[PDB]
Design a protein around this ligand. Structure first.
Ligand SMILES: CO[C@H](CO)c1ccc(C#Cc2ccc(C(=O)NC[C@H]3C[C@@H](NC(=O)[C@@H]4C[C@H](F)CN4)CN3C(=O)C3CC3)cc2)cc1
Ligand SMILES: [Zn+2]
Length: 298
C-alpha cells in the first residue's frame, strides 16, 4: 500500500511571542487538500496575504528564514516548518495574526506536541519525495553546505565556536533509527549575551528570554536548569536545517551535510539544487514495505 500524503486531522490553535518582534501572535494550523504544500497566511491584513513556504519566497533577512510577498513578510518559520517535516505533513494552512511565528520554548517541541495532540489524516494521493541523484555543494568563506545521494534521510552538522561552553560541536542523525521527536525536536535556539545586547540596542530580539532561548555569557549557560541534550547547540542547527530543507515543498530522500552553515547558505543550497535538475527527481512509493524511509502511525 502506497506512502500517502498527510494533512492535519483537526485545527491547532496556539499563542506566543515573536522572538524578534516581541509581538503576541495567534497561530492556527488547518487541514489543507492534496498537493497544497505548507502555505502561511497573514490573517491580520485585509485582504489576507498567503505565502507558500517555498525557496522562491525566501527574503534576504539576516536573522531567520523569512517568507516575503511584496512588502509583506513572515519571520522565523524554520522551527514550525521543521516540526511539519519531522511529522511528514505535506498539506496545511498556517494562519498568523502577526509578522513573526511565535518562538514557544525555542524548539519545535510545543509545535510537534500540538500537531500530534490533533493527530494527522492520510489523504488519497501518493506523497512526493525529492531524491538527490548527484552531489550538490556550496561554500562561502569557511561555511559549506552539501546534498549527497543517500537511500533514506540523514542530516550531519558541525559548528566551531571558540567559546569555553564548547562539549560536542558535531552530530549525525539517520531518521530511520533516530526519532526526530525524542532526539532533535526539543533542541532550543541559543544566543550569546554580547550578541543579544547588540540586537536589543538595534530594537531586535524583543521577545527573547531564558523561557525561549539557551542564554550563554562568556563562560556558561545562564539558564538556571541548563541543557536538555549534551549536544543541544549542534542538535538545534540540525533542527533549523530540517526546517530549511522543507522549503523544497516535499520530503527529502538524501543526506544533508552542514559545516558552520546557516539559513543564508542553506537557502543558496536549495536554489542551486532546484536549478540543477540533473541532481534530483520527484519519486513516489506504491509499496511502503520497500521504501527507504517509514512514518509513524497517523
Ligand atoms: C537578559 O534577559 C533578557 C530578558 O528579556 C533577554 C533578552 C533577549 C534574549 C534573547 C535572544 C536571542 C536573540 C537572537 C538569537 C539568535 O538569532 N541566535 C542565533 C544562533 C542560534 C542558531 N540559529 C537559530 O536558532 C535560527 C535563528 C533563530 F534563532 C531561529 N533559528 C545559530 N546561531 C548562531 O549562529 C549564533 C552565533 C550567532 C537567539 C536568542 C534573551 C533574554
Ligand atoms: Zn533555530
Amino acid at each position: 500500500s502506497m506512502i500517502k500524503q498527510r494533512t492535519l486531522k483537526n485545527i491547532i490553535r496556539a499563542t506566543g511571542v515573536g522572538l524578534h518582534s516581541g509581538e503576541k501572535v495567534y497561530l492556527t494550523l488547518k487541514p489543507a487538500p492534496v498537493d497544497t504544500g505548507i502555505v502561511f497566511s497573514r490573517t491580520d491584513l485585509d485582504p489576507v496575504v498567503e505565502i507558500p513556504a517555498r525557496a522562491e519566497n525566501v527574503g534576504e533577512t539576516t536573522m531567520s528564514t523569512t517568507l516575503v510577498k511584496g512588502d509583506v513578510k513572515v519571520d522565523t518559520v524554520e522551527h514550525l516548518l521543521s516540526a511539519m517535516a519531522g511529522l511528514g505533513i505535506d498539506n496545511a494552512y498556517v494562519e498568523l495574526s502577526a509578522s513573526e511565528v511565535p518562538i514557544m520554548d525555542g524548539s519545535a517541541g510545543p509545535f510537534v506536541f500540538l500537531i500530534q495532540s490533533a493527530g494527522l489524516q492520510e489523504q488519497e494521493a501518493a506523497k512526493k519525495f525529492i531524491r538527490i541523484k548527484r552531489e550538490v555543494s556550496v561554500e562561502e568563506g569557511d561555511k559549506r553546505a552539501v546534498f549527497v545521494p543517500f537511500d533514506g534521510f540523514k542530516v550531519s552538522f558541525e559548528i566551531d565556536f571558540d567559546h569555553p561552553v564548547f562539549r560536542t560541536q558535531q552530530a549525525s542523525v539517520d531518521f530511520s533509527s533516530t526519532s526526530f521527536v525524542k532526539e532533535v525536536s526539543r533542541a532550543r535556539t541559543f544566543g550569546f549575551m554580547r550578541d543579544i545586547e547588540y540586537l536589543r540596542s538595534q530594537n531586535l530580539a524583543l521577545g527573547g528570554s531564558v523561557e525561549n532561548a539557551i542564554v550563554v555569557d562568556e563562560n556558561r549557560v545562564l539558564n538556571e536548569d541548563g541543557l536538555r541534550y549534551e549536544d543541544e547547540f549542534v542538535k538545534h542547527k540540525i533542527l533549523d536545517a530540517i526546517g530549511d530543507l522543507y522549503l523544497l515543498g516535499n520530503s527529502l530522500i538524501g543526506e544533508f551535510r552542514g559545516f558552520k552553515s546557516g539559513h543564508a547558505l542553506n537557502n543558496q543550497l536549495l536554489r542551486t539544487l532546484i536549478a540543477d535538475k540533473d541532481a534530483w527527481e520527484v519519486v513516489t512509493f506504491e509499496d511502503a514495505r520497500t521504501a527507504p524511509i517509514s512514518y509513524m502511525r497517523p
